[PDB]
Design a protein around this ligand. Structure first.
Ligand SMILES: COc1cc2cc(c1Cl)N(C)C(=O)C[C@H](OC(=O)C(C)C)[C@]1(C)O[C@H]1[C@@H](C)[C@@H]1C[C@@](O)(NC(=O)O1)[C@H](OC)/C=C\C=C(\C)C2
Ligand SMILES: Nc1nc2c(ncn2[C@@H]2O[C@H](COP(=O)(O)OP(=O)(O)OP(=O)(O)O)[C@@H](O)[C@H]2O)c(=O)[nH]1
Ligand SMILES: Nc1nc2c(ncn2[C@@H]2O[C@H](COP(=O)(O)OP(=O)(O)OP(=O)(O)O)[C@@H](O)[C@H]2O)c(=O)[nH]1
Ligand SMILES: [Ca+2]
Ligand SMILES: [Mg+2]
Ligand SMILES: [Mg+2]
Lengths: 440, 67, 421
């Protein structure tokens, strides 16, 4: 059992969903029509990949996923795309009018019209579960749906499913691909509203991903397609422990124990390696030591920040492919005597390690080289607060003049919600500061 | 110890229910507050437009009392 | 889909309105019969935004043609793409405004406005999801100006949760010898600042100066001025008409362009009148603005820029960054990342590549000050006040409209002077 239900909200959530589920299918040998030849138990099973796929009597493996967007044109492409047979039509939910980069419309005006239908379809997946573990929620910070509707959904999910675990993959805005001037507003509002209702959230800085595509894959002007294929690899690495089995395999929930010292401190920093082109990977093998050392190059992080100027509260290494503990231990011992790695004084310094022997996979016609071994580091660093600081500053610049605020007030919101949300962010920045101070 | 064991699991149930309860109530209040505000904004808009109509009547009226 | 309902009022409105439909019908590859004869599926993916699809694959403009005189109505129907418009959507009076704002707004137009609304309503109710309305008109006349602003108020009563966009043509003595135009403009602006969400300020002063000084066309015809208008209107709707990420609809445009509700008057720009670098330098040049304002006399609140044609998108990103850095003083710092760049790889007709500009600049006040200068002098003179009071208007409605436009100017000045700290 231990089923996980994925919920993809808004354009960013949906399109990243497309990348992830395409990638999962290739990893598990699932065809676009949903058939899986290697799977001999027809109509059901207790295998590890069943945490993410349900099975029909006809042998179809169906994603435990819901796609939601307040406008139809993004999900329509799924309905008519390569993997359209993969999803039951009821898993793909669309309204007629989007939130127009407005949190208020996503949470209230437009969102309230479809929220009940969404919860009903989610309920239908959950009742098929024999032991539901929790939810994985994909969304942008900047969009009106990604911000507004997500926070509404997360609130409602806490009511309907109690303390059942809820994880986030949140797309943090970058100006190179930004769509709205008000994305700082939407970011602060959804972060404030979802904070109590999320157990663990993996932020993905679009600029971090943008830079990696430019620097490591030599993509002059990365598209969402370039970004999402890279993002899906990090997501795959994180969910791999749920979808595969193995002796040295460590469940994501075990890492979670280490990553979250306090409820509000639940934002791990992700760092992935190797990201390399076919051209460069040719006749060049990246060893365990090399990819592990790459995890401490800030250029490889999913979020722009400097952990070297912060303190660690946890360090997890999630390997996949040709990797054995001996090489990991050797690589770690080398790194600790050469990197700027400093822990807070109230936490142990040991690195927690997981290994999935299933090697990395790449999507056809993709920019990433196929490698024998990869690693995703999940660390809890005070430095990730830098991402909050940058967003909060941009928020302050506009809110001081109340720029664009009338678009929110016009949809029923009050200025008190802005100030309340900003105060919570200030407390959160202070929290990350407090945990880094030495004990008395 | 048996009694303490009961009190601990009862506390966990209580706090879990209290969280569900306060979330349900906090949300219902927000959607209600938002419904009132948005309606009040639209209502104020129509009222201003509806006195533009009353003004136009007064103008056409003023033209008939012009002759 | 997300439909826009187009409305054109008065002579100016119908002139530029017709040319607008001629240009985009060509871009979307449909002939004056309404049949499609294109080559790219991208032409039809978002065709329903402006067109109704009829039986036999016939695309009909979602357009409503209005005027208080039946003259122009025959012009359109006889002009090219005249047989594509819906016959029932022609709504004409017989009287004619004669450049009297009061007649268009309170008298003659108020008696034709309902039969216009009936057509608006019929088009609207057949929309899968109406996003809003766009109006083409001048502010110097009587019909397009006075009745156009009446229709806006009336439409906003029945569709208050929709976006109201306008292409307003501003009066200039360099083009029209009519003397009362600054009355009509001020009275209109009094209405537009309250009841529209987005207004494209098409300034005849700017259109004239471009034709005369850059295109070197002494004695410029309305055809010359409208060639600029059509190219502009094509540019600022590209994001609405073709598959895109940025300002793909009227509401998302408004949210990105309007930081304060009253400050919704944009000065558009167009280039050329090439290399990616000087395309960018031109579109930010005062000579290429369709509003007679110097952007370096104020600060940009927000900016939207679309480049069209096949070009290096890396180069466009670099140069848009370049312009913001070299001209950092002319973008307000209390709005981070206020400049947005779009790219459509299908160019306009005739050009291999072009660039359209939409700026919300505090320098727009230069345009309102020009009108106000004429208006205030006319108000003291009291020249031709009887034609307005003759329809039942009061002298205060002139005063109120004046001071409201004065407020708009000072409000644009307020945020121009504002600092981060
Ligand atoms: C002998 O001297 C002159 C004689 C006339 C005009 C002028 C001079 Cl000096 N000047 C200065 C002007 O600037 C022209 C302008 O009119 C124009 O729009 C244009 C048609 C000329 C106007 C009057 O200010 C405009 C509105 C008050 C308008 C006028 C009208 O159109 N109807 C109406 O209700 O209001 C009307 O009847 C149809 C015809 C035209 C008027 C007459 C008075 C000529
Ligand atoms: N990485 C990545 N980011 C995306 C993608 N699509 C959109 N974004 C980002 O998401 C933000 C905009 O939010 P969207 O998800 O597009 O908007 P939305 O969720 O549909 O909400 P609406 O306003 O109602 O459309 C911007 O910062 C974009 O850069 C994507 O496919 N991949
Ligand atoms: N750019 C441009 N301006 C025009 C055009 N036609 C008229 N105008 C301007 O419009 C202003 C007067 O408004 P009109 O549209 O002509 O008059 P109307 O709105 O039809 O109202 P009435 O004529 O009184 O019934 C003048 O300042 C003209 O310069 C045009 O084709 N192009
Ligand atoms: Ca099975
Ligand atoms: Mg969307
Ligand atoms: Mg006329």
């Amino acid at each position: 059992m231990r089923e996980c239900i994925s919920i993809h909200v808004g354009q960013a959530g949906v399109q990243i969903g497309n990348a992830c589920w395409e990638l999962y299918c290739l990893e598990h040998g699932i065809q676009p029509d949903g058939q899986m030849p290697s799977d001999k138990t027809i109509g059901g099973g207790d295998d590890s990949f069943n945490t993410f796929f349900s099975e029909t009597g006809a042998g179809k493996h169906v994603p435990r996923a819901v796609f939601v967007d307040l406008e139809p044109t993004v999900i329509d492409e799924v309905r008519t795309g390569t993997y359209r047979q993969l999803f039951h039509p009821e898993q793909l939910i669309t309204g007629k009018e989007d939130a127009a980069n407005n949190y208020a419309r996503g949470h209230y005006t437009i969102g309230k019209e479809i929220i009940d239908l969404v919860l009903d379809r989610i309920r239908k997946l959950a009742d098929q579960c024999t032991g539901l573990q929790g939810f994985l929620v994909f969304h942008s910070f900047g969009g009106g749906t990604g911000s507004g509707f997500t926070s509404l959904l997360m609130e409602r999910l806490s009511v309907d499913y109690g303390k059942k675990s809820k994880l986030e993959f949140s797309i943090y805005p970058a100006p190179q691909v930004s769509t709205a001037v008000v994305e700082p507003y939407n970011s602060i509002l959804t972060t404030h509203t979802t904070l109590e209702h999320s157990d663990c959230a993996f932020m993905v800085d679009n600029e971090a991903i943008y830079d990696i595509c430019r620097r490591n894959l030599d993509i002059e002007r990365p598209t969402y397609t370039n970004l999402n294929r890279l993002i899906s690899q990090i997501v795959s690495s994180i969910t791999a422990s749920l979808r595969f089995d193995g002796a040295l395999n460590v469940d994501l929930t075990e890492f979670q124990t280490n990553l979250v010292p306090y409820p509000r401190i639940h934002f791990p920093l992700a760092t992935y390696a190797p990201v390399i082109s076919a051209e460069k990977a040719y006749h060049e093998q990246l060893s365990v030591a090399e990819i592990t050392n790459a995890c401490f190059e800030p250029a490889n992080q999913m979020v722009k920040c400097d952990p070297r100027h912060g303190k660690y509260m946890a360090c997890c290494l999630l390997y996949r492919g040709d990797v054995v503990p001996k090489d990991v231990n050797a690589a770690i011992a080398t790194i600790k005597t050469k990197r700027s790695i400093q822990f807070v004084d109230w936490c142990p310094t040991g690195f927690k390690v997981g290994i999935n022997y299933q090697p990395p996979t790449v999507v056809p016609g993709g920019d990433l080289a196929k490698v024998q071994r990869a690693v995703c580091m999940l660390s809890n660093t005070t430095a990730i607060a830098e991402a909050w600081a940058r967003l909060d500053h941009k928020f302050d610049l506009m809110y001081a003049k109340r720029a664009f605020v009338h678009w929110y007030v016009g949809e029923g919101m009050e200025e008190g919600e802005f100030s309340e949300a900003r105060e919570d962010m200030a407390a959160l920045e202070k929290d990350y500061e407090e945990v880094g101070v030495d004990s008395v | 110890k048996r009694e303490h064991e009961r009190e601990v699991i009862q506390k966990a149930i209580e706090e879990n229910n209290n969280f569900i309860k306060m979330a349900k109530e906090k949300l219902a209040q927000k959607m209600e507050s938002n419904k009132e505000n948005r309606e009040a904004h639209l209502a104020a808009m129509l009222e201003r437009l509806q006195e533009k109509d009353k003004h136009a009547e007064e103008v056409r009226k003023n033209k008939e009392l012009k002759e | 889909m997300r439909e826009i309902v187009h409305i054109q009022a008065g002579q100016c409105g119908n002139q530029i309105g017709a040319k607008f439909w001629e240009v985009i019908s060509d871009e979307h590859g449909i002939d004056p019969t309404g049949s499609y004869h294109g080559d790219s599926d991208l032409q039809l993916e978002r065709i329903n935004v402006y067109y109704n699809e009829a039986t036999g694959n016939k695309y009909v403009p979602r357009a409503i043609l209005v005027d208080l005189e039946p003259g122009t109505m025959d012009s359109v129907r006889s002009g090219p793409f005249g047989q594509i418009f819906r016959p029932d959507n022609f709504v004409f009076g017989q009287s004619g405004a004669g450049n009297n704002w009061a007649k268009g707004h309170y008298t003659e137009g108020a008696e034709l406005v309902d039969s216009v609304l009936d057509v608006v309503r019929k088009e609207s109710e057949s929309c899968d999801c109406l996003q809003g309305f766009q109006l083409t008109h001048s502010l110097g006349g009587g019909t397009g100006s006075g009745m156009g602003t009446l229709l806006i108020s009336k439409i906003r009563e029945e569709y208050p949760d929709r976006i109201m966009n306008t292409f307003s043509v501003m009066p200039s003595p360099k083009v029209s010898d009519t003397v009362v135009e600054p009355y009509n403009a001020t009275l209109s602006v009094h209405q537009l600042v309250e009841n529209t969400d987005e207004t494209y300020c098409i300034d005849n002063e700017a259109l004239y100066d471009i034709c005369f000084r850059t295109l070197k066309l002494t004695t410029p015809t309305y055809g010359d001025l409208n060639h600029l208008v059509s190219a502009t209107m094509s540019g600022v709707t590209t994001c609405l008409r073709f598959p895109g990420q940025l300002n793909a609809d009227l509401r998302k445009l408004a949210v990105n362009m309007v930081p304060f509700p009253r400050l919704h008057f944009f000065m558009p720009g167009f280039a050329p009148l090439l290399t990616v670098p000087e395309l960018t330098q031109q579109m930010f040049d005062s000579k290429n603005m369709m509003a007679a304002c110097d952007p370096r006399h104020g600060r940009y609140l927000t900016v939207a820029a679309i480049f069209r044609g096949r070009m290096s998108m890396k180069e466009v990103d670099e140069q848009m960054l370049n312009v913001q850095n070299k001209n950092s003083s002319y973008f307000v710092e209390w709005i981070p990342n206020n400049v947005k760049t779009a790219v459509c790889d299908i160019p306009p007709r005739g050009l291999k590549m072009s660039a359209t500009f939409i700026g919300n600049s505090t320098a727009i006040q230069e345009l309102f000050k020009r009108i106000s200068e004429q208006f205030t002098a006319m108000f003291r003179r009291k020249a031709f006040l009887h034609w307005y009071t003759g329809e039942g208007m009061d002298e205060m409605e002139f005063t109120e409209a004046e001071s409201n436009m004065n407020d708009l100017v000072s409000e644009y000045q307020q945020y121009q002077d504002a600092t981060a700290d």
